[PDB]
Amino acid sequence: LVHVASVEKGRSYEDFQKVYNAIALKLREDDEYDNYIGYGPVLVRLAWHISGTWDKHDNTGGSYGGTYRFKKEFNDPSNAGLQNGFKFLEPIHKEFPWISSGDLFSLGGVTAVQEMQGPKIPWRCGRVDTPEDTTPDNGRLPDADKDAGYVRTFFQRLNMNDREVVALMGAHALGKTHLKNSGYEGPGGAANNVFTNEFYLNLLNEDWKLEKNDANNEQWDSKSGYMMLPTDYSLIQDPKYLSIVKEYANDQDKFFKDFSKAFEKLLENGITFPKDAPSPFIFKTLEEQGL
Numbered sequence: 001l002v003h004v005a006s007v008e009k010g011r012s013y014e015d016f017q018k019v020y021n022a023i024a025l026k027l028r029e030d031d032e033y034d035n036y037i038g039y040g041p042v043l044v045r046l047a048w049h050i051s052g053t054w055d056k057h058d059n060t061g062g063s064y065g066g067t068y069r070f071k072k073e074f075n076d077p078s079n080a081g082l083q084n085g086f087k088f089l090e091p092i093h094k095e096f097p098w099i100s101s102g103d104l105f106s107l108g109g110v111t112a113v114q115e116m117q118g119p120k121i122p123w124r125c126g127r128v129d130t131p132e133d134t135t136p137d138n139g140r141l142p143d144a145d146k147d148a149g150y151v152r153t154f155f156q157r158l159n160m161n162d163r164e165v166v167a168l169m170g171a172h173a174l175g176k177t178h179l180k181n182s183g184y185e186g187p188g189g190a191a192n193n194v195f196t197n198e199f200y201l202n203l204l205n206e207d208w209k210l211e212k213n214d215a216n217n218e219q220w221d222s223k224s225g226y227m228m229l230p231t232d233y234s235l236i237q238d239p240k241y242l243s244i245v246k247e248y249a250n251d252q253d254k255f256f257k258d259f260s261k262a263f264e265k266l267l268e269n270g271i272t273f274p275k276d277a278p279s280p281f282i283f284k285t286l287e288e289q290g291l
Ligand code: HEM
Pocket: 041, 042, 044, 045, 048, 080, 081, 142, 143, 144, 151, 168, 169, 171, 172, 174, 175, 176, 177, 178, 179, 181, 182, 183, 184, 229, 231, 263
């Protein structure tokens, strides 16, 4: 199965910058969502979950086909709460009907990271909607109750190595867990709608206590009112992961650079870009455009 990127007919960088700008203006407007967090975090999670169904062994899933629009994937228990991000993007798709679903969902995540003062994430267009029968079955996204070995095995299905895993997990500074979505509750830190290396700092510097939550699941809780999933905490239990967590806690710039590469890789897994496709786009923030 090969998925060749095909540029939306006649569209260039400026067209996609307009879609980025619409997303970013709506992010700015809808600032009350989820007790004033805004939609940035859920859009990052959306872009990851539409990408994270990929299987390197047969090229099923991944961001290319935009299959999250189909009920089987939209209703995956692993995706509970992402309907909020889908609803946010609907008026954007209405304004730009020519964009593919996979391009829109992935661009949502890129826009969110940059508008939250994160690193620039290069982004490529050309994902093409595929039919309902190409929707991956549920069960391809990761469980949170597991250990470092599980995390490493899981991410190898996505061709991600240790550094890429640790860098991607830093997105868990953003937003929060919600008991009714996932059976976990709480934020990972204080700055949860600005992109920083706080996840790593908190892992290393907080006084964590293993507790059961109100859904009877184990999570690690700090006196500051932060939480970590067992899979997050595993990054300081595994010696290889711990070394990288320390690196990113010490150097936010290095974290930014590694996250940008890993996040682009995640969103492009499964896609063959023809050698004459456009170079990756780097979108200007609203601030950079005076908008
Ligand atoms: C071992 C891998 C991972 C596991 C087990 C995991 C698990 C979870 C869980 C259980 C939630 C809470 C969902 C809810 O209650 O609303 C969550 C939220 C989140 N996840 Fe992850 N995650 C993983 C990796 C990632 C990656 C790779 C990214 C993106 C780079 C990411 C980005 C986020 C974001 C931004 C949120 C907050 C969403 C919001 O505030 O609505 N996660 N994750």
